[PDB]
Amino acid sequence: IPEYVDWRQKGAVTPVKNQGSCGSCWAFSAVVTIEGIIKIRTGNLNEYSEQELLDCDRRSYGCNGGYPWSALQLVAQYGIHYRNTYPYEGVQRYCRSREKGPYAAKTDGVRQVQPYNEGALLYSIANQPVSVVLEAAGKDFQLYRGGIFVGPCGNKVDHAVAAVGYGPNYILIKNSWGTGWGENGYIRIKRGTGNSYGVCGLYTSSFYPVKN
């Protein structure tokens, strides 16, 4: 795999979103990977509905949080609608998939990256954007305004994001805190420190959708 990957340069990444006060990071994370894999396989970049996952993933807990892998499972079982058909409201409501017509996209499954393994995550990122989790509770993360982020942070992962690239010394992350945070909404987190958990626990739990 190459020294640099940046799925934004391949046109596989939609604009940065703001999840708002809702604990919907798991759905935003999942949607990034869906937008990525659909562009990679079909050549079309579309935005898909975080709200639908928020409303419809019965294994997750809406704005109280949830699981990227569950959301990715739901898109593989059922599918997902376009974002403009099912826009983000920042509150869990009832699942309205059936009221909004045919699904716009569907994946074929979800795979987990081997945890605690930097190389395994990089390999997945070279193939497509990946859902990853990190510890975002620390003030250093929240106040990040740019640069390669080294912490401080623990490994109490609490925030799902999407890895959309990497470089020799970093993994490039699309956050869901709007364009005012970090580097136009992105963070570069140091890699290669030999910490098996990754910086801020970044290697704890990573998933990506499969689309044949």
Ligand SMILES: *[C@@H](C(=O)O)[C@H](O)C(=O)N[C@H](C(=O)NCCCCCCCCN)C1CCC1
């Ligand atoms: C992330 C965000 O910033 O929006 C959001 O908090 C999240 O999904 N985090 C997530 C998580 O904590 N998952 C478990 C939620 C349990 C809620 C329990 C509700 C019932 C209680 N009786 C994980 C993936 C990122 C860390």
